[PDB]
Design a protein around this ligand. Structure first.
Ligand code: MN
Ligand code: MN
Lengths: 48, 48
């Protein structure tokens, strides 16, 4: 639930990085996004 | 500044994952933390 606080936290970071990537096409950003996508898998795996 | 919103966002995620790792010693968590540490480098590099 602390694990649910974490997943929403990632879920927000991906919304904002996506958007960040929307206007500033910077490779470093697609990569951070890659990782946050994996963060999300891993937490939803540990949960439900 | 959108890049500053991102860094605080990571800076918080590392506070909470550290803490999350404090009580539930789960390897997946030290690894997420590893990545967030790198997220932070990369953004402070792009900034100041
Ligand atoms: Mn993450
Ligand atoms: Mn991150």
């Amino acid at each position: 639930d602390y694990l649910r606080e974490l997943l929403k936290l990632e879920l927000q970071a991906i919304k904002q990085y996506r958007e960040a990537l929307e206007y500033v096409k910077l490779p470093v950003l697609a990569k951070i996004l890659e990782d946050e996508e994996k963060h999300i898998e891993w937490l939803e795996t540990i949960l439900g």
